[PDB]
Write a protein that binds this ligand. Structure first.
Ligand code: HEM
Ligand SMILES: CC(c1ccc(O)cc1)c1ccc(O)cc1
Length: 137
């Protein structure tokens, strides 16, 4: 289920963090407007870039903490407000997050593995609802 999925993802975190972000960027190429240093690069080139590895892993480390602190796939309001108020998230709207979780769920469905994709799909919708309540446009 969802809890075990958090353990599975954490057990190969750098790999999953990079592969899910690439799935997102490749499914939604327009989302690179937010990541101009990643333009004009193949996946293997991005996986050679120090900030792409560093940043993807720090993002996913916090994503897994947000998921782990959730009840029934509903994140804490404190975690939603941290994600809205972060200076690095000044430009974003909830649609950026919806798209990320669509790509994450698709990734999991396409994997060989028994991820609980329906729990991740809920988590993404509930995180979007929480971000909207905490003031993200
Ligand atoms: C639950 C999902 C997310 C979490 C937990 C999260 C977390 C973080 C964290 C911890 C950082 C700091 C990274 C560092 O400085 O090394 C960061 C930066 C950033 N995040 Fe988020 N983020 C999420 C979703 C998103 C989404 C959906 C977008 C845009 C589509 C986004 C855009 C950014 C940008 C532009 C930065 C700063 C620039 C950069 O680090 O390359 N984030 N995020
Ligand atoms: C959107 C986010 C991310 C999405 C999915 C992941 O598995 C890891 C990270 C992100 C933020 C800043 C970056 O520099 C790189 C990526």
């Amino acid at each position: 289920g969802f809890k075990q999925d958090i353990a599975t993802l954490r057990g190969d975190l750098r790999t999953y963090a990079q592969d899910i972000f690439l799935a997102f960027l490749n499914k939604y190429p327009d989302e690179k407007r937010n990541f101009k240093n990643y333009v004009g690069k193949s996946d293997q080139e991005l996986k050679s870039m120090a900030k792409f590895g560093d940043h993807t892993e720090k993002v996913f480390n916090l994503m897994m903490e947000v998921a782990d602190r959730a009840t029934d796939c509903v994140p804490l309001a404190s975690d939603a407000s941290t994600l809205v108020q972060m200076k690095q998230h000044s430009g974003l709207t909830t649609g950026n997050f919806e798209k990320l979780f669509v790509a994450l769920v698709e990734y999991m469905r396409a994997s060989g593995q028994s991820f609980d994709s329906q729990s991740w799909d809920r988590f993404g919708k509930n995180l979007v609802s929480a971000l909207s309540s905490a003031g993200m446009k």
